Structure formats: structure tokens, C-alpha cells
PDB file of C-alpha atoms and ligand atoms in Angstrom:
ATOM      1  CA  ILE A   1     -17.281 210.078 152.838  1.00 18.72           C
ATOM      2  CA  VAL A   2     -13.888 210.651 154.420  1.00 21.38           C
ATOM      3  CA  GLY A   3     -13.091 213.961 154.767  1.00 21.95           C
ATOM      4  CA  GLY A   4     -16.174 215.798 153.595  1.00 24.02           C
ATOM      5  CA  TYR A   5     -18.849 217.570 155.196  1.00 22.03           C
ATOM      6  CA  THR A   6     -22.455 217.617 156.365  1.00 17.01           C
ATOM      7  CA  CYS A   7     -24.485 218.512 153.140  1.00 15.82           C
ATOM      8  CA  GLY A   8     -27.227 220.236 154.605  1.00 13.84           C
ATOM      9  CA  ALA A   9     -30.766 218.726 154.964  1.00 14.67           C
ATOM     10  CA  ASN A  10     -32.553 217.856 151.130  1.00 14.86           C
ATOM     11  CA  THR A  11     -29.612 219.817 149.340  1.00 15.51           C
ATOM     12  CA  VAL A  12     -28.734 216.949 147.343  1.00 20.21           C
ATOM     13  CA  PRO A  13     -32.533 216.187 145.936  1.00 19.75           C
ATOM     14  CA  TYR A  14     -31.806 213.201 144.020  1.00 18.79           C
ATOM     15  CA  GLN A  15     -29.745 211.265 146.355  1.00 21.14           C
ATOM     16  CA  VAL A  16     -31.423 207.790 147.775  1.00 19.72           C
ATOM     17  CA  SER A  17     -30.942 205.549 150.197  1.00 20.75           C
ATOM     18  CA  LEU A  18     -31.116 201.803 149.354  1.00 20.97           C
ATOM     19  CA  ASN A  19     -32.294 200.018 152.355  1.00 24.17           C
ATOM     20  CA  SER A  20     -32.830 196.242 153.339  1.00 24.54           C
ATOM     21  CA  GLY A  21     -33.496 196.948 157.332  1.00 27.22           C
ATOM     22  CA  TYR A  22     -30.439 199.291 157.434  1.00 25.04           C
ATOM     23  CA  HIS A  23     -28.620 201.473 154.874  1.00 23.75           C
ATOM     24  CA  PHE A  24     -26.517 199.642 152.209  1.00 24.09           C
ATOM     25  CA  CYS A  25     -26.017 201.874 149.259  1.00 24.47           C
ATOM     26  CA  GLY A  26     -26.968 205.013 147.674  1.00 25.31           C
ATOM     27  CA  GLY A  27     -28.125 205.586 144.384  1.00 26.07           C
ATOM     28  CA  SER A  28     -29.337 208.333 141.921  1.00 20.99           C
ATOM     29  CA  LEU A  29     -33.264 209.296 141.156  1.00 17.78           C
ATOM     30  CA  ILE A  30     -33.271 210.065 136.923  1.00 21.03           C
ATOM     31  CA  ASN A  31     -36.838 210.234 136.675  1.00 23.72           C
ATOM     32  CA  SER A  32     -39.701 209.801 138.750  1.00 20.85           C
ATOM     33  CA  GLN A  33     -39.833 205.801 138.388  1.00 20.22           C
ATOM     34  CA  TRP A  34     -36.221 204.886 137.991  1.00 22.20           C
ATOM     35  CA  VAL A  35     -33.123 204.976 140.257  1.00 24.35           C
ATOM     36  CA  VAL A  36     -29.424 204.230 138.814  1.00 22.79           C
ATOM     37  CA  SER A  37     -26.983 202.534 141.473  1.00 23.61           C
ATOM     38  CA  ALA A  38     -24.068 200.358 141.172  1.00 28.02           C
ATOM     39  CA  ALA A  39     -24.607 196.543 140.094  1.00 28.41           C
ATOM     40  CA  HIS A  40     -22.672 195.331 142.891  1.00 26.37           C
ATOM     41  CA  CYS A  41     -25.426 196.923 145.177  1.00 25.66           C
ATOM     42  CA  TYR A  42     -27.794 194.167 144.110  1.00 28.84           C
ATOM     43  CA  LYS A  43     -29.852 192.497 146.459  1.00 31.68           C
ATOM     44  CA  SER A  44     -33.604 191.198 146.792  1.00 30.45           C
ATOM     45  CA  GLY A  45     -36.260 192.990 149.349  1.00 31.12           C
ATOM     46  CA  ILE A  46     -34.632 196.351 148.297  1.00 29.98           C
ATOM     47  CA  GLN A  47     -36.792 199.729 149.717  1.00 30.86           C
ATOM     48  CA  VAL A  48     -35.516 202.981 147.890  1.00 31.60           C
ATOM     49  CA  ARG A  49     -35.733 205.744 150.320  1.00 30.63           C
ATOM     50  CA  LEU A  50     -35.905 209.583 149.112  1.00 27.98           C
ATOM     51  CA  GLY A  51     -35.624 212.973 150.316  1.00 22.81           C
ATOM     52  CA  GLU A  52     -33.701 211.658 153.190  1.00 24.83           C
ATOM     53  CA  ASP A  53     -31.191 213.506 155.455  1.00 22.12           C
ATOM     54  CA  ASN A  54     -30.976 211.860 158.950  1.00 21.08           C
ATOM     55  CA  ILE A  55     -31.196 208.174 157.900  1.00 17.25           C
ATOM     56  CA  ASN A  56     -32.288 207.047 161.342  1.00 16.38           C
ATOM     57  CA  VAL A  57     -35.286 209.710 162.105  1.00 14.71           C
ATOM     58  CA  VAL A  58     -38.396 210.105 160.213  1.00 18.64           C
ATOM     59  CA  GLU A  59     -37.991 213.783 160.238  1.00 19.47           C
ATOM     60  CA  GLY A  60     -40.666 214.365 157.352  1.00 21.01           C
ATOM     61  CA  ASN A  61     -40.104 214.814 153.302  1.00 21.52           C
ATOM     62  CA  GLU A  62     -39.141 211.106 153.371  1.00 25.04           C
ATOM     63  CA  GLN A  63     -40.583 208.663 150.631  1.00 25.35           C
ATOM     64  CA  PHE A  64     -40.456 204.846 150.969  1.00 22.81           C
ATOM     65  CA  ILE A  65     -41.139 202.849 147.850  1.00 21.46           C
ATOM     66  CA  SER A  66     -40.293 199.747 146.964  1.00 22.28           C
ATOM     67  CA  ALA A  67     -38.268 198.220 144.190  1.00 20.86           C
ATOM     68  CA  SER A  68     -40.311 196.648 141.847  1.00 23.47           C
ATOM     69  CA  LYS A  69     -37.275 195.296 139.517  1.00 23.31           C
ATOM     70  CA  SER A  70     -33.413 195.540 139.822  1.00 26.18           C
ATOM     71  CA  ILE A  71     -31.643 195.437 136.411  1.00 24.97           C
ATOM     72  CA  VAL A  72     -28.221 194.538 136.698  1.00 24.68           C
ATOM     73  CA  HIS A  73     -25.998 195.145 133.722  1.00 24.27           C
ATOM     74  CA  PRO A  74     -25.872 191.797 131.625  1.00 25.91           C
ATOM     75  CA  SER A  75     -22.153 192.620 131.099  1.00 26.88           C
ATOM     76  CA  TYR A  76     -21.515 193.249 134.558  1.00 27.43           C
ATOM     77  CA  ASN A  77     -18.245 191.025 135.845  1.00 25.81           C
ATOM     78  CA  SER A  78     -18.323 190.987 139.509  1.00 23.06           C
ATOM     79  CA  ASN A  79     -14.197 190.577 139.881  1.00 22.96           C
ATOM     80  CA  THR A  80     -13.298 193.077 137.523  1.00 23.59           C
ATOM     81  CA  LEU A  81     -16.242 195.610 138.559  1.00 26.29           C
ATOM     82  CA  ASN A  82     -16.394 196.469 134.923  1.00 23.49           C
ATOM     83  CA  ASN A  83     -19.688 197.476 133.909  1.00 22.39           C
ATOM     84  CA  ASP A  84     -20.821 198.077 137.500  1.00 19.94           C
ATOM     85  CA  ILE A  85     -24.413 199.676 136.768  1.00 17.00           C
ATOM     86  CA  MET A  86     -27.682 198.695 137.987  1.00 14.65           C
ATOM     87  CA  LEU A  87     -31.404 200.134 137.149  1.00 14.66           C
ATOM     88  CA  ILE A  88     -33.922 200.194 139.933  1.00 14.47           C
ATOM     89  CA  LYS A  89     -37.620 200.633 138.500  1.00 13.58           C
ATOM     90  CA  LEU A  90     -40.096 201.800 141.575  1.00 15.56           C
ATOM     91  CA  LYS A  91     -43.414 200.110 142.521  1.00 16.28           C
ATOM     92  CA  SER A  92     -45.028 203.775 142.113  1.00 17.99           C
ATOM     93  CA  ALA A  93     -43.474 206.804 140.928  1.00 23.47           C
ATOM     94  CA  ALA A  94     -41.951 208.951 143.153  1.00 23.38           C
ATOM     95  CA  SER A  95     -43.575 212.537 144.102  1.00 22.61           C
ATOM     96  CA  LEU A  96     -40.973 215.077 142.647  1.00 24.39           C
ATOM     97  CA  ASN A  97     -40.520 218.500 144.685  1.00 24.62           C
ATOM     98  CA  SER A  98     -38.127 220.642 145.960  1.00 26.24           C
ATOM     99  CA  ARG A  99     -36.503 218.162 148.185  1.00 26.45           C
ATOM    100  CA  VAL A 100     -36.842 215.230 145.930  1.00 28.30           C
ATOM    101  CA  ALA A 101     -35.654 215.826 142.314  1.00 27.13           C
ATOM    102  CA  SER A 102     -34.229 214.000 139.496  1.00 25.35           C
ATOM    103  CA  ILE A 103     -30.567 214.350 138.280  1.00 25.97           C
ATOM    104  CA  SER A 104     -29.751 214.796 134.613  1.00 27.49           C
ATOM    105  CA  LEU A 105     -28.079 212.021 132.208  1.00 26.39           C
ATOM    106  CA  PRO A 106     -24.960 213.559 130.043  1.00 25.66           C
ATOM    107  CA  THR A 107     -24.756 214.200 126.911  1.00 26.90           C
ATOM    108  CA  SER A 108     -21.104 214.079 126.828  1.00 27.14           C
ATOM    109  CA  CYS A 109     -18.489 212.856 129.019  1.00 25.30           C
ATOM    110  CA  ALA A 110     -16.615 215.218 131.397  1.00 25.04           C
ATOM    111  CA  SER A 111     -12.849 215.826 130.725  1.00 22.58           C
ATOM    112  CA  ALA A 112      -9.871 215.656 133.616  1.00 22.83           C
ATOM    113  CA  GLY A 113      -9.918 218.543 136.130  1.00 22.58           C
ATOM    114  CA  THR A 114     -13.814 218.859 135.973  1.00 21.43           C
ATOM    115  CA  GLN A 115     -14.838 219.249 139.440  1.00 21.21           C
ATOM    116  CA  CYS A 116     -18.026 217.252 140.794  1.00 22.67           C
ATOM    117  CA  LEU A 117     -20.038 216.755 143.953  1.00 20.15           C
ATOM    118  CA  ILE A 118     -19.970 213.279 145.514  1.00 18.27           C
ATOM    119  CA  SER A 119     -22.323 212.489 148.238  1.00 19.64           C
ATOM    120  CA  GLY A 120     -23.498 209.358 150.596  1.00 24.06           C
ATOM    121  CA  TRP A 121     -24.068 207.701 154.019  1.00 20.07           C
ATOM    122  CA  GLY A 122     -20.752 205.594 153.855  1.00 18.94           C
ATOM    123  CA  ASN A 123     -17.966 205.335 156.487  1.00 17.44           C
ATOM    124  CA  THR A 124     -16.364 208.358 157.177  1.00 15.35           C
ATOM    125  CA  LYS A 125     -13.374 207.155 158.235  1.00 16.87           C
ATOM    126  CA  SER A 126     -10.116 206.013 156.727  1.00 13.77           C
ATOM    127  CA  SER A 127      -8.561 203.652 159.622  1.00 15.08           C
ATOM    128  CA  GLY A 128     -11.531 201.674 161.427  1.00 14.28           C
ATOM    129  CA  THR A 129     -15.546 202.518 160.762  1.00 15.15           C
ATOM    130  CA  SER A 130     -17.928 205.222 161.832  1.00 15.85           C
ATOM    131  CA  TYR A 131     -21.278 205.717 160.090  1.00 16.94           C
ATOM    132  CA  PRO A 132     -22.796 209.232 159.896  1.00 14.54           C
ATOM    133  CA  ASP A 133     -26.557 210.107 160.519  1.00 14.67           C
ATOM    134  CA  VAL A 134     -26.662 212.523 158.058  1.00 17.53           C
ATOM    135  CA  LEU A 135     -26.201 212.845 154.200  1.00 17.98           C
ATOM    136  CA  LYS A 136     -21.850 213.729 153.676  1.00 15.93           C
ATOM    137  CA  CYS A 137     -20.694 215.797 150.933  1.00 15.34           C
ATOM    138  CA  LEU A 138     -17.229 215.874 149.355  1.00 14.28           C
ATOM    139  CA  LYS A 139     -16.223 218.033 146.016  1.00 21.16           C
ATOM    140  CA  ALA A 140     -13.570 216.042 144.235  1.00 17.48           C
ATOM    141  CA  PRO A 141     -12.023 216.695 140.441  1.00 15.84           C
ATOM    142  CA  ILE A 142     -11.879 213.973 137.674  1.00 15.80           C
ATOM    143  CA  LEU A 143      -7.987 212.786 137.514  1.00 14.45           C
ATOM    144  CA  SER A 144      -6.596 212.175 133.913  1.00 15.93           C
ATOM    145  CA  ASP A 145      -6.309 208.949 132.820  1.00 14.60           C
ATOM    146  CA  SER A 146      -2.664 208.605 132.913  1.00 14.88           C
ATOM    147  CA  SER A 147      -2.912 209.256 136.550  1.00 14.01           C
ATOM    148  CA  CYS A 148      -5.843 206.735 136.897  1.00 15.89           C
ATOM    149  CA  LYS A 149      -3.805 203.950 135.507  1.00 15.75           C
ATOM    150  CA  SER A 150      -0.805 204.214 137.047  1.00 16.65           C
ATOM    151  CA  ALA A 151      -2.466 204.145 140.586  1.00 13.57           C
ATOM    152  CA  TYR A 152      -4.562 200.909 139.608  1.00  9.75           C
ATOM    153  CA  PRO A 153      -2.279 199.336 136.794  1.00  7.14           C
ATOM    154  CA  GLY A 154      -4.408 196.943 134.359  1.00  8.02           C
ATOM    155  CA  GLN A 155      -7.792 197.457 136.473  1.00  9.82           C
ATOM    156  CA  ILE A 156      -8.653 200.295 135.079  1.00  8.99           C
ATOM    157  CA  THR A 157     -11.451 199.819 132.127  1.00  8.77           C
ATOM    158  CA  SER A 158     -12.758 202.420 129.694  1.00  7.78           C
ATOM    159  CA  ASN A 159     -15.822 202.386 131.774  1.00  6.90           C
ATOM    160  CA  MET A 160     -13.999 203.876 134.714  1.00 10.72           C
ATOM    161  CA  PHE A 161     -12.451 207.028 136.081  1.00 14.58           C
ATOM    162  CA  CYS A 162     -10.814 208.128 138.963  1.00 15.55           C
ATOM    163  CA  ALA A 163     -11.431 211.119 140.912  1.00 15.26           C
ATOM    164  CA  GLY A 164     -10.310 212.360 144.263  1.00 18.24           C
ATOM    165  CA  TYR A 165      -7.000 213.803 145.794  1.00 15.38           C
ATOM    166  CA  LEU A 166      -3.650 211.392 145.212  1.00 13.45           C
ATOM    167  CA  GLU A 167      -2.769 213.014 148.886  1.00 12.30           C
ATOM    168  CA  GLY A 168      -5.194 210.999 150.570  1.00  8.16           C
ATOM    169  CA  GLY A 169      -7.563 212.295 153.469  1.00  7.65           C
ATOM    170  CA  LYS A 170     -10.696 212.987 151.178  1.00  3.14           C
ATOM    171  CA  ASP A 171     -12.421 209.849 149.191  1.00  2.00           C
ATOM    172  CA  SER A 172     -15.765 207.988 149.109  1.00  2.00           C
ATOM    173  CA  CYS A 173     -15.911 204.636 150.848  1.00  2.00           C
ATOM    174  CA  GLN A 174     -18.047 201.746 151.801  1.00  2.00           C
ATOM    175  CA  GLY A 175     -21.439 202.466 152.591  1.00  2.00           C
ATOM    176  CA  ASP A 176     -21.261 205.247 149.523  1.00  2.00           C
ATOM    177  CA  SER A 177     -21.298 202.530 146.884  1.00  2.00           C
ATOM    178  CA  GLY A 178     -24.116 203.006 144.080  1.00  2.00           C
ATOM    179  CA  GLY A 179     -24.154 207.129 144.932  1.00  2.00           C
ATOM    180  CA  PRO A 180     -23.424 209.879 142.431  1.00  2.00           C
ATOM    181  CA  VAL A 181     -20.819 211.488 141.420  1.00  2.00           C
ATOM    182  CA  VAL A 182     -22.222 214.965 139.662  1.00  2.00           C
ATOM    183  CA  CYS A 183     -20.250 217.221 137.351  1.00  2.00           C
ATOM    184  CA  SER A 184     -22.264 220.529 136.218  1.00  2.00           C
ATOM    185  CA  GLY A 185     -25.491 219.381 137.048  1.00  2.00           C
ATOM    186  CA  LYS A 186     -25.164 215.591 135.198  1.00  6.31           C
ATOM    187  CA  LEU A 187     -24.365 212.546 136.454  1.00  6.03           C
ATOM    188  CA  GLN A 188     -21.167 211.574 135.537  1.00  8.03           C
ATOM    189  CA  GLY A 189     -20.259 208.716 137.979  1.00  6.93           C
ATOM    190  CA  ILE A 190     -21.360 205.799 140.053  1.00 10.38           C
ATOM    191  CA  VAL A 191     -19.172 205.278 143.352  1.00 10.52           C
ATOM    192  CA  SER A 192     -17.737 201.671 142.597  1.00  8.34           C
ATOM    193  CA  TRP A 193     -14.330 200.957 144.112  1.00  6.78           C
ATOM    194  CA  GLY A 194     -11.259 201.715 145.369  1.00  8.61           C
ATOM    195  CA  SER A 195      -7.860 200.200 147.648  1.00  8.40           C
ATOM    196  CA  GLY A 196      -9.227 201.037 151.398  1.00  7.98           C
ATOM    197  CA  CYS A 197     -10.433 204.634 151.784  1.00  9.30           C
ATOM    198  CA  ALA A 198      -8.411 208.100 151.549  1.00  8.34           C
ATOM    199  CA  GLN A 199      -5.062 206.177 150.994  1.00 13.76           C
ATOM    200  CA  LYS A 200      -2.405 208.259 149.388  1.00 12.82           C
ATOM    201  CA  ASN A 201      -2.036 207.520 145.393  1.00 12.16           C
ATOM    202  CA  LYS A 202      -5.093 205.408 145.835  1.00 10.83           C
ATOM    203  CA  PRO A 203      -8.233 207.750 144.643  1.00 11.64           C
ATOM    204  CA  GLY A 204     -11.775 206.414 144.360  1.00 10.31           C
ATOM    205  CA  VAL A 205     -12.986 204.557 141.214  1.00 11.15           C
ATOM    206  CA  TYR A 206     -16.441 205.514 139.410  1.00 11.38           C
ATOM    207  CA  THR A 207     -18.357 203.658 136.731  1.00 10.06           C
ATOM    208  CA  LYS A 208     -17.956 206.312 133.643  1.00 14.45           C
ATOM    209  CA  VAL A 209     -21.651 206.795 133.220  1.00 15.46           C
ATOM    210  CA  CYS A 210     -21.865 208.955 130.086  1.00 14.55           C
ATOM    211  CA  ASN A 211     -20.589 205.290 128.377  1.00 13.10           C
ATOM    212  CA  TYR A 212     -24.436 203.957 129.378  1.00 13.66           C
ATOM    213  CA  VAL A 213     -26.535 206.871 128.300  1.00 10.93           C
ATOM    214  CA  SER A 214     -27.793 204.651 125.224  1.00 11.80           C
ATOM    215  CA  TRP A 215     -28.392 201.393 127.234  1.00 13.00           C
ATOM    216  CA  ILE A 216     -30.130 203.015 130.257  1.00 13.86           C
ATOM    217  CA  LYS A 217     -32.667 205.341 127.917  1.00 15.23           C
ATOM    218  CA  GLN A 218     -33.600 201.872 125.614  1.00 15.61           C
ATOM    219  CA  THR A 219     -33.431 199.804 128.708  1.00 17.82           C
ATOM    220  CA  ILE A 220     -36.137 202.236 131.005  1.00 14.95           C
ATOM    221  CA  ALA A 221     -38.283 202.586 127.239  1.00 12.84           C
ATOM    222  CA  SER A 222     -38.471 198.523 126.857  1.00 14.01           C
ATOM    223  CA  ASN A 223     -39.565 198.369 130.737  1.00 15.02           C
TER     224      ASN A 223
HETATM  225  C1  BX3 B   1      -8.868 192.784 140.475  1.00 14.30           C
HETATM  226  C2  BX3 B   1      -9.402 194.226 139.892  1.00 14.30           C
HETATM  227  N1  BX3 B   1      -9.846 194.467 138.604  1.00 14.30           N
HETATM  228  N2  BX3 B   1     -10.038 195.071 141.007  1.00 14.30           N
HETATM  229  C3  BX3 B   1     -10.894 195.991 140.668  1.00 14.30           C
HETATM  230  C4  BX3 B   1     -12.447 195.511 141.383  1.00 14.30           C
HETATM  231  C5  BX3 B   1     -12.092 194.868 142.610  1.00 14.30           C
HETATM  232  O1  BX3 B   1     -12.380 196.421 143.749  1.00 14.30           O
HETATM  233  C6  BX3 B   1     -12.695 196.136 144.875  1.00 14.30           C
HETATM  234  C7  BX3 B   1     -14.256 195.673 145.101  1.00 14.30           C
HETATM  235  C8  BX3 B   1     -14.575 195.720 146.415  1.00 14.30           C
HETATM  236  C9  BX3 B   1     -13.745 196.008 147.389  1.00 14.30           C
HETATM  237  C10 BX3 B   1     -14.330 196.037 148.704  1.00 14.30           C
HETATM  238  C11 BX3 B   1     -14.356 197.301 149.693  1.00 14.30           C
HETATM  239  C12 BX3 B   1     -15.020 199.114 148.944  1.00 14.30           C
HETATM  240  C13 BX3 B   1     -16.635 198.905 148.733  1.00 14.30           C
HETATM  241  C14 BX3 B   1     -16.886 200.233 148.179  1.00 14.30           C
HETATM  242  C15 BX3 B   1     -16.014 201.209 148.133  1.00 14.30           C
HETATM  243  C16 BX3 B   1     -16.595 202.679 147.507  1.00 14.30           C
HETATM  244  C17 BX3 B   1     -15.491 203.145 147.264  1.00 14.30           C
HETATM  245  C18 BX3 B   1     -14.056 203.442 147.853  1.00 14.30           C
HETATM  246  C19 BX3 B   1     -12.844 204.289 147.560  1.00 14.30           C
HETATM  247  N3  BX3 B   1     -11.722 204.500 148.080  1.00 14.30           N
HETATM  248  N4  BX3 B   1     -13.342 205.614 146.837  1.00 14.30           N
HETATM  249  C20 BX3 B   1     -13.607 201.968 148.211  1.00 14.30           C
HETATM  250  C21 BX3 B   1     -14.484 201.064 148.690  1.00 14.30           C
HETATM  251  C22 BX3 B   1     -13.849 199.361 149.035  1.00 14.30           C
HETATM  252  C23 BX3 B   1     -14.297 194.641 149.646  1.00 14.30           C
HETATM  253  O2  BX3 B   1     -12.704 194.728 150.043  1.00 14.30           O
HETATM  254  O3  BX3 B   1     -14.860 194.190 150.163  1.00 14.30           O
HETATM  255  C24 BX3 B   1     -12.529 196.916 147.493  1.00 14.30           C
HETATM  256  C25 BX3 B   1     -12.054 196.533 145.985  1.00 14.30           C
HETATM  257  C26 BX3 B   1     -10.830 194.089 142.856  1.00 14.30           C
HETATM  258  C27 BX3 B   1      -9.519 194.819 142.181  1.00 14.30           C
HETATM  259 CA1   CA B   2     -34.730 208.383 158.938  1.00 11.98          CA
END
């Protein structure tokens, strides 16, 4: 997260860290046994780490659970990043409490202007690389479809939305991928892509979760 702030230990209880010997992607806990992330985060040998703040020190409250199966959306396209969504089933159900809790799926899509909270352990620099120990947060509004498509001509599908600041300086970045975009207590987006990080007129692009609620529910029910 570039231009964000330190969230505070366990203040984003649904935030998950995907680990394979190091943090590589974020995710959101949607129930005791399922996590939603980005399809481009797919990898074998994924350990889901819940209740994390400092990802390098064991501070208490952490729950490490192996992924039993990762389900990449069947229509995911790796070049366009359309349908960039993946469901991860935990080997065992997580112990939900004050510091580890699930986030609700939306019943309707969010409108332009809606303020949302984006979080992650991704790169904190626009020019260069600097990864944080603790979780970073950023409040950003959903932009209009017009501005989104003007920024990324011919690259925005109906399953994507832009969020952020056109003036640059505040944005999600590499490492934040798969993480949550929560608006009014509902998971509306998943960190997907963008051109660089926190660049002028190049806001972040996110997977539009409201378009996948039926798919998520049907898939979870059959697995
Ligand atoms: C051709 C086309 N339709 N598109 C859309 C999808 C695709 O977008 C992508 C896909 C991957 C990449 C990465 C780097 C990367 C990875 C994760 C990111 C997450 C968030 C942000 C952001 N600025 N909000 C930027 C990121 C930039 C890389 O360089 O490895 C960058 C753009 C290419 C451009
Ligand atoms: Ca740690």
C-alpha cells in the first residue's frame, strides 16, 4: 500500500496473508473455511495465515492453516486479468473470534464515490521497493466507469472497477494482490492490477466481486 497508514494490530480481522515461505498475496476470509483471493495469486503449497499483523514475528493470535484446494475461476484469462478471482478452501475451519472474523459478500454493487478500505502487506513505494512488517491501510473511493475507461482504454471489462486517486500518491501495489476492498462492511473488490503504483492518472483496478456472488455461493455449496 503506497501512501497509506498502519492499520493497527488485528483491526482488519478478515485480512489473510498467503504464504509459501514468504508473503506473496493477500486474501479475505468469507466464512470459517473459505478464503477469496485473486486468480493470479494461484500457486501450489499455499499456507493461509490468519490473525496476522507483523508478518515476520509470532505475536500471538495467528492461525496457520494449509489450503486443501484452490479453485481458480474457470474463465480466468491471464493476459487480460478478466475474472481474476480464486476461492481457497482451508484444510480445517478457522477459529473465529475478535481478531479473526469473516467479511460479508455484497447483495448489490457499490456506486462511484463510495469510500472503501483497502489493506495489505504489499510494496509501500511508487519508485523502488519497500515491504512493511505490519499491515497497511488506505481509504479510497470507487471511481466512475468513465474515468476508469479513460485511464485504461480497452482494458476495463464489466468485471472490473477503478478505485483510488488520479493525482497519484495513494494506491495498492504488488504484494497487495488478492487483498480486500471493503465498502460499508461488504467485500466489493479484490486487488488485481494497475500500471505501476500510485502513478498520476493510473488508479488501481479491482475485481468486481458483486458480479461473482452467485458463482461463489454455488461453488462453495458443491465443494
Ligand atoms: C493488456 C491488458 N488488458 N492489461 C490488463 C491486465 C495486465 O495487467 C497487469 C498484470 C500484472 C502486472 C504486474 C505488476 C503489478 C501487480 C499487482 C498490482 C496490484 C495493484 C496495482 C495498483 N497500481 N493498484 C498494481 C499492480 C502491478 C507485472 O508487471 O508483473 C501489471 C499489469 C496487463 C494490461
Ligand atoms: Ca509474523
